[PDB]
Structures are given as structure tokens and as C-alpha cells.
Design a protein around this ligand. Structure first.
Ligand SMILES: Cc1noc(NS(=O)(=O)c2ccc(NCc3cnc4nc(N)[nH]c(=O)c4n3)cc2)c1C
Length: 256
């Protein structure tokens, strides 16, 4: 089918980016073509301090509670089962786990409990004994099997290469050049490179985040041609409109 467009909603201020004002943005995102709304309030980067579970729920639930009643799939960016279960009780559809269940292994039992979808992102401290691609596939496939043991079917298990996590710009380029190997897993692949430092290397010069939406859409079109099924972007309108063109051209070539 179509490539799902996952919009970013950051609860907190962020360098790359109120309840009533958040709902206004959520309504704007779907009009720009957002298929999924990823609500996040955490960051697994080393340049941050981990916040308590109670603080995280005070961040996501006021916005989630308002938006669960819309005609859109809702994704929650969290790696702690207590936060995901609380959102799953409200009726969210996707749990975006940045640690792929490594931080909290109860995430698989909770997501499978509510018959929901889970995103498994490749992450780490940056150390590995094998090449980044082989290490990424080894780590993700092991976590993907753990979700299937819990009862989650393969269609509902998403794989994210984790661009910007435990990788250098050279290791990120090695992953982006071999995206077909990650799609060969037959799991739906989610690509998230919106306004990231990888994007900065594509232009070759120092830029602000908002001027990296064009090269972000380039990764979107390139990813769809490789076989990815969803993209996590900031600029929904540019990527959702561009993805529809690539999906149109890919379906047109397959039909003819
Ligand atoms: C400062 C500064 N200048 O550029 C950057 N960009 S970056 O280092 O590559 C960078 C690194 C990490 C993040 N985390 C943001 C983030 C949050 N949730 C995600 N969920 C999924 N499934 N996949 C993702 O990729 C993902 N990324 C965002 C940006 C920063 C940070």
C-alpha cells in the first residue's frame, strides 16, 4: 500500500523543532498528510539526563488524551513499559521504542497485550565487535523475535536503523548504502533521518535544521525506492506529498 507518514510531535523544546496549542499542530499535521503521530518526551542520547516516569507521563498524557479521539494512528516515543501501558490504555496504536526492549523487556508483553504495533530502533553506546550493519541486523532481528514470542505478528514489528544513535557519520553512510539488507528482513522498515546530522553531510555545509527538509525528503524518496514502509519526518507536508509521488511512480511501474 502507501508509505505511512509519521509526523514528529515533541512534547519538549528541541533544537531541530501547551495542550490546546499542541492539538492545533496535530490537526495541521494530518492535513499535511500525516498517517501517524509520534508523541515523544524522552531522548536516549548521551547529551541528556533521564527524567522520571511520573514526569514523562505528565508530558505525554495531556497531549495524548486530547488526540486519541482523532482519525489517526497515535505513536508514543518511550522505552519504559509503565509509560507505554498507560498510553495503550488510552488507545494508542504504535509504541516507538528507542531501545527495542533492551531497557525494559516488559515492553514486548505490554504491546502484545494490547495487540498494538511496536517500533524497534537500533541504539547503543557506539561500541561494537562487528561492522555496524552486521551488528545492527543482529541486534534488531533478536529483538524482533522477542516481540514475536510475546505474540506480536511480523507485520506489526517495525525496524528502525537508528540514524544518529551509536553511529558515526561514516557508519551512518554504511547503513544508508545497504538499506536493502534491512528491508530483506521482511519487517516493515521505518526511516527517521529528519534534520539530523547525516542530513548536514549531504549538503556539505553548515545549515539550520529547517533548511534540511529538502535533503530529508531526498532520503524519503530514496528509502521508498529501497523498500521502506514509513518515514519519521518533521516537515510532514513536503515528505507526505513527495512520498505520494514516489508511491505513484512505483505502483505505476509495478502495474505496467
Ligand atoms: C545538536 C544536533 N545537531 O544535529 C543533531 N542531529 S543528530 O545528532 O543526528 C540526532 C540524533 C538523535 C536524535 N533523536 C531524535 C529521535 C527521536 N525518536 C526517534 N525514533 C525512531 N524510531 N527513530 C529515530 O531516529 C528517532 N530519533 C535526533 C537527532 C543534533 C542532536
Amino acid at each position: 500500500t502507501k508509505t505511512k507518514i509519521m509526523g514528529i510531535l515533541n512534547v519538549t523544546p528541541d533544537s531541530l523543532s501547551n495542550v490546546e496549542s499542541a492539538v492545533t499542530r496535530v490537526k495541521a499535521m494530518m492535513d499535511e498528510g500525516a498517517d501517524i503521530i509520534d508523541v515523544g518526551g524522552v531522548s536516549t542520547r548521551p547529551g541528556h539526563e533521564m527524567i522520571t516516569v511520573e514526569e514523562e507521563l505528565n508530558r505525554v498524557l495531556p497531549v495524548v488524551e486530547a488526540i486519541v479521539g482523532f482519525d489517526v494512528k497515535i505513536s508514543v516515543d518511550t522505552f519504559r513499559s509503565e509509560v507505554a501501558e498507560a498510553c495503550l490504555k488510552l488507545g494508542v496504536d504504535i509504541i516507538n521504542d528507542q531501545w527495542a526492549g533492551l531497557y525494559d523487556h516488559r515492553m514486548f508483553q505490554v504491546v502484545a497485550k494490547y495487540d498494538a504495533e511496536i517500533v524497534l530502533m537500533h541504539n547503543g553506546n557506539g561500541n561494537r565487535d562487528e561492522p555496524v550493519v552486521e551488528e545492527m541486523l543482529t541486534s534488531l532481528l533478536a529483538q524482533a523475535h522477542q516481540a514475536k514470542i510475546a505474540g506480536i505478528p511480523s507485520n506489526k514489528i517495525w525496524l528502525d536503523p537508528g540514524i544518529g544513535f551509536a553511529k558515526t557519520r561514516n557508519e551512518e553512510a554504511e547503513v544508508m548504502a545497504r538499506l536493502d539488507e534491512l528491508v530483506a528482513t521482511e519487517y516493515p522498515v521505518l526511516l527517521a533521518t529528519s534534520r539530523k546530522r547525516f542530513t548536514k553531510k549531504m549538503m556539505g555545509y553548515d545549515t539550520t535544521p529547517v533548511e534540511r527538509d529538502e535533503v530529508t525528503a531526498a532520503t524519503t524518496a530514496y528509502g521508498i525506492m529501497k523498500g521502506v514502509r514509513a518515514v519519521r519526518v518533521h516537515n510532514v507536508e513536503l515528505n507526505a506529498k513527495l512520498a505520494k509521488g514516489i508511491d505513484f511512480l512505483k505502483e505505476n511501474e509495478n502495474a505496467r
